[PDB]
């Protein structure tokens, strides 16, 4: 049993998690550490994860008038800015208004 945090992945034994930006590809063995490969194009993971697939970045729909503040990394999502003429509807940032 047991398992130290940010490592805690336990299945017969204690494996480590994936650093944010990496996703799981193979479990660990009695004598092999976890797999983890870095998140693909358009994808990210901000957690020490035991996840198969990363998530797609936020988008920022221009049909709703959204710019991009920070183009997301494999570690952080895309920071969704609002139009350079329009104010954001709610504390970052789904609907935009005048």
């Amino acid at each position, epitope marked *: 049993t047991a398992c130290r945090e940010k490592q805690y992945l336990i299945n017969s034994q204690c494996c480590s998690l994936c650093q944010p930006g990496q996703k*799981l590809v193979s479990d660990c063995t009695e004598f092999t550490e976890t797999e983890c490969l870095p998140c693909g194009e358009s994808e990210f993971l901000d957690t020490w994860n035991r996840e198969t697939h990363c998530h797609q970045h936020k988008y920022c729909d221009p049909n709703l008038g959204l710019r991009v503040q920070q183009k997301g990394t494999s570690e952080t999502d895309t920071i969704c800015t609002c139009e350079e003429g329009w104010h954001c509807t709610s504390e970052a940032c789904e609907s935009c208004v005048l």
Partner: antibody
């Protein structure tokens, strides 16, 4: 190394059933979930779905769901796949697949069985 | 359901050549693409995982590239043994689909 040995070739009349075995060896059977693939004579490959070698919970791809079914005998390191109400369209070669190393999704099939040809005929 | 279009359907190549077998998805499948080699009277063999990553035992020649919608399996110096059918398969969302196959025909 890791090995996937399958059952012999079967012939069944349409509307009957058939079960194909898969005897995994070279690893901890319950650590890695078992999957199944259907190779159509000549034609392409279709992923049937997968089973959890720990919980026993299967995820079947829609077309295959209802007629195809994953069953396993842990004690023997053997996973099975049984096709119910056999259709003529089911005459294909069946493969049990493994990998990655977890009991999750993982589309990369690093380990394949030898194949089991099912023949649906009167 | 994703659609993995593998063109050319067939490809006749002399040995030693550089080869580039293509795979294009309907949606963007990010880096969830895998490559399989199926020789005659043999089960498939995983060559490439997650579009670019090398498989333990696969000859040096084979290498893969690509992201999102267009991917490419490249055989550096085509050998007469590399005669088979090559499949691409995705991971980015249930269910998983394979491709056409690109039959590789060695010239002599």
């Amino acid at each position: 190394q890791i090995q996937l040995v399958q059952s012999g070739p079967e012939l069944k009349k349409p509307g009957e059933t058939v079960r194909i075995s898969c005897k995994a060896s070279g690893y901890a059977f319950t650590t890695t979930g078992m999957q199944w693939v259907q190779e159509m004579p000549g034609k392409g490959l279709k992923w049937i779905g997968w089973i959890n070698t720990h919980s026993g919970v299967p995820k079947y791809v829609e077309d295959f769901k209802g007629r195809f079914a994953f069953s396993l005998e842990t004690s023997a390191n053997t996973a099975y796949l049984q096709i119910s109400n056999l259709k003529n369209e089911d005459t294909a070669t069946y493969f049990c697949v493994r990998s990655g190393n977890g009991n999750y999704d993982l589309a990369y099939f690093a380990y394949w069985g030898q194949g089991t040809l099912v023949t649906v005929s009167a | 359901d994703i659609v993995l279009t593998q063109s050319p359907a067939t490809l006749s190549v002399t040995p030693g050549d550089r080869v580039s077998l293509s795979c294009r998805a309907s949606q963007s499948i990010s880096d969830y693409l895998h490559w399989y080699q199926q020789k005659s009277h043999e089960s498939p063999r995983l060559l490439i995982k997650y579009a670019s990553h090398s498989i333990s035992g696969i000859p040096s020649r084979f290498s893969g590239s690509g992201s999102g919608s267009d991917f490419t399996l490249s055989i550096n110096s085509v050998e007469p043994e590399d005669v088979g059918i090559y499949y691409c398969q995705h991971g980015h969302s249930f269910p998983w689909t394979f491709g056409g196959g690109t039959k590789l025909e060695i010239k002599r």
